[PDB]
Amino acid sequence: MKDFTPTPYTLECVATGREFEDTGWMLADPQCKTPSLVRAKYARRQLEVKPDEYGFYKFCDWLPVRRMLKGSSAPVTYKSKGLARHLGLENLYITFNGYYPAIGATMSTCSFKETEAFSVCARAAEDEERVLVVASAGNTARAFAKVCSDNHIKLLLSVPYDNIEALWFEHPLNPCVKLISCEKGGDYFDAIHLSDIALKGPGFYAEGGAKNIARRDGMATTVLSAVTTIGRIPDYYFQAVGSGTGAIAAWEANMRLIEDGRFGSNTMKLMVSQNAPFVPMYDAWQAGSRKMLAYEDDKARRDAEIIDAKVLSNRRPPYGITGGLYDALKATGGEFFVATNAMARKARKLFKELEGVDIYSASGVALASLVNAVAAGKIEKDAVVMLNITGGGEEHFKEDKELWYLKPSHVFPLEPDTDDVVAKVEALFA
Numbered sequence: 001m002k003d004f005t006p007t008p009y010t011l012e013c014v015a016t017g018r019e020f021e022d023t024g025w026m027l028a029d030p031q032c033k034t035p036s037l038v039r040a041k042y043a044r045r046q047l048e049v050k051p052d053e054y055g056f057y058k059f060c061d062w063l064p065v066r067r068m069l070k071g072s073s074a075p076v077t078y079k080s081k082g083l084a085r086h087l088g089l090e091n092l093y094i095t096f097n098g099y100y101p102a103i104g105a106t107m108s109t110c111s112f113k114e115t116e117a118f119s120v121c122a123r124a125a126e127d128e129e130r131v132l133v134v135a136s137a138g139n140t141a142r143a144f145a146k147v148c149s150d151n152h153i154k155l156l157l158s159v160p161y162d163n164i165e166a167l168w169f170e171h172p173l174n175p176c177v178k179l180i181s182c183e184k185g186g187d188y189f190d191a192i193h194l195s196d197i198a199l200k201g202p203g204f205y206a207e208g209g210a211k212n213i214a215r216r217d218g219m220a221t222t223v224l225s226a227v228t229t230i231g232r233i234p235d236y237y238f239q240a241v242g243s244g245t246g247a248i249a250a251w252e253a254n255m256r257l258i259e260d261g262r263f264g265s266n267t268m269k270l271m272v273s274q275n276a277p278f279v280p281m282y283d284a285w286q287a288g289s290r291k292m293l294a295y296e297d298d299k300a301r302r303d304a305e306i307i308d309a310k311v312l313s314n315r316r317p318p319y320g321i322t323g324g325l326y327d328a329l330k331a332t333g334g335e336f337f338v339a340t341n342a343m344a345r346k347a348r349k350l351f352k353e354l355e356g357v358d359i360y361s362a363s364g365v366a367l368a369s370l371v372n373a374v375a376a377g378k379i380e381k382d383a384v385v386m387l388n389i390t391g392g393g394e395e396h397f398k399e400d401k402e403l404w405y406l407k408p409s410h411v412f413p414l415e416p417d418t419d420d421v422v423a424k425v426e427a428l429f430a
């Protein structure tokens with residue numbers, strides 16, 4: 001690997017603007033009381049894409065990484081022919097994050113969570129002796145599991161039992177990757193809660209979800225790939241959202257590109273989408289409100305079971321936090337759409353038929369967004385549209401593959417006892 005310099009950056013509290021050094025794994029500005037994201041301010045103001053050998057890290061100028069890891073792949077962006085003609089769009093670009101070797105997409109875990117995994121794991125110290133803790137609906141978990149296993153990084157995953165089928169792998173994992181689950185019936189936020197209980201134990205630290213600049217700047221490489229491929233900033237960004245981290249990241253990528261100057265100065269409009277009937281962020285945005293409406297916990301867990309796109313069901317997303325999704329929608333004049341399971345299933349067939357690879361339900365929600373937006377006359381036919389296919393190639397990939405599944409060492413009730421969880425996760429890594 002090449003003579004690589006850790007990326008220079010400082011941190012900025014979005015709420016105030018306070019600028020300060022990252023002491024390592026800062027996930028908030030401790031001088032700020034309001035909930036606020038921090039954002040990386042990169043010293044390399046102008047993006048210089050490294051050669052392809054760098055894989056995902058070809059974008060490291062704007063990633064908070066101290067090292068590179070082997071075997072990464074970057075988002076692939078290409079101009080659509082099938083889908084574009086079907087929609088009458090002249091400038092439709094697909095940014096594909098998954099397994100589709102024909103176009104050069106080699107994210108073998110089949111989602112853009114690989115950008116999160118490779119970026120976050122590269123931000124961490126390699127002397128780090130604490131166990132990294134990650135909660136996921138499935139896709140983030142599969143990404144960190146692979147990367148952390150390949151690189152002997154201690155990782156505790158918190159995935160809901162109902163989602164553990166997502167934890168498939170070509171080969172048995174390293175024993176440095178351990179998994180615990182919230183019981184059958186719980187959803188992703190229940191898994192967050194289990195992971196926050198486990199974090200009460202010494203020797204464990206949190207990935208932090210959307211609070212981790214590595215996760216956002218990792219995800220933002222879809223937009224970097226798109227802009228550096230197309231040669232300008234798109235007019236529309238379509239992405240199904242569960243936490244909205246990738247939409248926040250897209251916005252942040254847009255701002256950095258504008259500060260860069262060489263690609264124009266327009267602001268990409270965010271077109272984000274949720275799977276009915278789990279549509280809390282959509283409902284709040286339709287209300288013009290920074291506050292999430294009231295969502296009775298049992299109903300939300302049922303709605304989470306109903307939707308096809310299981311990664312889309314987050315009860316506690318970075319919606320209202322300063323710098324979060326509400327702020328990004330307001331800043332980009334963005335729009336929020338809903339897709340039914342039915343629309344999503346049609347969208348998946350459509351994409352397979354016209355672009356030649358299978359995609360996740362979640363990506364199908366975004367595709368459905370696009371179809372409905374176009375049909376409503378919202379998209380100029382010459383508009384530059386980035387469709388972010390956040391996951392694809394699972395069928396394609398599992399084809400004639402013996403798969404190995406990560407199963408939980410412990411399954412806990414929805415409100416576990418702190419003592420039990422702590423003593424068990426402690427035991428897990430001793």
Ligand SMILES: Cc1ncc(COP(=O)(O)O)c(C=O)c1O
Nearest residue numbers: 139242243244245246362390391
């Ligand atoms: C395939 C897929 N679609 C949609 C999403 C939701 O994206 P976000 O994290 O920006 O909410 C994810 C998140 O991991 C995903 O993996």
